[PDB]
């Protein structure tokens, strides 16, 4: 399968209540594996998956040195951006950064990305070619010229096509049992009478991995979105995911309706009926 | 593994 490593940075100013809070999270596919929180006690990059714990103490020293410095650059960024937009020093504002690398199932470089957001909206981002910039408004043009002078795009490209992919491959081997599994969904259907005459057929999908699933409802072998509720895929809390679909049907018409489940962990797409 | 490079906006 295809895989990815992704890092997420979030800095939140809090004027009058101390230094900005900085949260850093690391992800391989849908599995979070590292964490840093500027308010936490340890002040260290902490492991959040077991397979990363077999990295040595020098790895954790270096990740801690980088993430502590990155917390401060983004602290500076909050002040820089506040000036770019003529904003008072009373409001709380947010800085967000996300970068990573996708690899194909041959595990070689496929795609890279590096995005910056200020206050929940686009600020500056690298283009797919990893060579130019997309500046959102005109303030971001200031940063675009700053980063083109420092040749920043060429340096991110060097990390994404190199260190990013090669350490993603190492993580995929360090945790082959966790990261390379596919857990097919545990599916069942429930029936909940709510009315004198009408009923809800709920179609469950539990304990699957990865999170990519498709639940669609069919009536008489025909697709139907009318009268359907879909919840967004959610984590069970143990490294698996859940999702369900429900449709409202008239009583005595239940067995006109079929639920369909698509997941890469299933050799064939499942069909479920009320029985 | 994080990128070491520091970038300032």
């Amino acid at each position, epitope marked *: 399968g295809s895989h990815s490593m992704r890092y997420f940075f979030t800095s939140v100013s809090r004027p009058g209540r101390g230094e900005p809070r900085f949260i850093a999270v690391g992800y391989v596919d849908d599995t979070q594996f590292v964490r840093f929180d500027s308010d936490a006690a340890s002040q260290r990059m902490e492991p959040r998956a077991p397979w990363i714990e077999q990295e040595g103490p020098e790895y954790w020293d270096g990740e801690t*040195r980088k993430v502590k410095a990155h917390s*401060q650059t983004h602290r500076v960024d909050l*002040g820089t951006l506040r000036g770019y937009y003529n904003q008072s020093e009373a409001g709380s504002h947010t800085v967000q950064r996300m970068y990573g690398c996708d690899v194909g199932s041959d595990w070689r470089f496929l795609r890279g990305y590096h995005q910056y957001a200020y206050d929940g909206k686009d600020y500056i981002a690298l283009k797919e070619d990893l060579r130019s910039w997309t500046a959102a408004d005109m303030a971001a043009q200031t940063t675009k010229h700053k980063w083109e002078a420092a040749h920043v795009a060429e340096q*991110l490209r*060097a990390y994404l096509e190199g260190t990013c992919v090669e350490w993603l491959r190492r993580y995929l081997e360090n945790g082959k049992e966790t990261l390379q599994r596919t857990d097919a969904p545990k599916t069942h259907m429930t029936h909940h009478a709510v009315s004198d005459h009408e009923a809800t057929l709920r179609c469950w999908a539990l304990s699957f991995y990865p999170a990519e699933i498709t639940l669609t409802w069919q009536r008489d072998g025909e697709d139907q979105t009318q009268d359907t509720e879909l919840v967004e895929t959610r984590p069970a809390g143990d490294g698996t995911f859940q999702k369900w679909a429900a449709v409202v049907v008239p009583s005595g018409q239940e067995q006109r309706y079929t639920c369909h489940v698509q997941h890469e962990g299933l050799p064939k797409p499942l069909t479920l009926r009320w029985e | 593994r994080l990128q070491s490079l520091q970038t300032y906006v």
Partner: T-cell receptor, first 112, second 115 residues
């Protein structure tokens, strides 16, 4: 996790002859910069060469060329047709978690 | 029009206070402090970007401090001075857009702490 090594602390070159100042470094990154700095007895530090590790090409500055071997983690400085003004301390440096980390330095003495 | 260091040499008796001072190149938003001995070499002490300290892991355990009150100057303060502090203390500034910006060094300040 990020170290620079200059093993020969003293070097001597005959005037107008060429001299190579060795440097090896340790890093686990693919985005980094390599630098050579020169310190005359003035003590003012000045940049000689810069090598971006992504650029494959051996950066050259007139007489000053560099033998960048990314695989071997070596970054030797070649000074051709040396002159009396080249007598100084040369420092190998690298980018990384610390923006600049310097080697121990080599004192080049130029024999007139 | 370069990094200004104040003063060139400085001779102080131990126990006194020492305040090195440095002015970056105008326009530069980042400033680095180094110290040079021939025992340990060139070591980073602390650097700032937009007057915010980004890293001070290189600063001594107990008598050293550094401020950058505004973009125009930063002070490094030893209190109290000791003979082991004798070194050349360099200041460098960069544009402050990336940690790979080339660093522009000052002439240094040679500090000698006598018994």
């Amino acid at each position: 996790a990020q170290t620079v090594t200059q093993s020969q602390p003293e070097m001597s070159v005959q005037e107008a002859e060429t001299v190579t100042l060795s440097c090896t470094y340790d890093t686990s990154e693919s985005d980094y910069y390599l630098f050579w700095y020169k310190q005359p007895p003035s003590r003012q530090m000045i940049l000689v060469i810069r090598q971006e590790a992504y650029k494959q090409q051996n950066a050259t500055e007139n007489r000053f060329s560099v033998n960048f071997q990314k695989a071997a983690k070596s970054f030797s400085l070649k000074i051709s047709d040396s002159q009396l003004g080249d007598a100084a301390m040369y420092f190998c440096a690298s980018s990384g978690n610390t923006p600049l980390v310097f080697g121990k330095g080599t004192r080049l003495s130029v024999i007139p | 029009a370069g990094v200004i260091q104040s003063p060139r040499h400085e001779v102080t008796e131990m126990g006194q206070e020492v305040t090195l001072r440095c002015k970056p190149i105008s326009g530069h938003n980042s400033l680095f402090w180094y110290r040079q001995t021939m025992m340990r070499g060139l070591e980073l002490l602390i650097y700032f970007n937009n007057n915010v300290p980004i890293d001070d892991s290189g600063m001594p355990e107990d008598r050293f401090s550094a401020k950058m009150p505004n973009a125009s100057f930063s002070t490094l303060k030893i209190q109290p001075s000791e003979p082991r502090d004798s070194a050349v203390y360099f200041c460098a500034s960069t544009w402050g857009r990336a940690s790979t910006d080339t660093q522009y060094f000052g002439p240094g300040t040679r500090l000698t702490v006598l018994e």
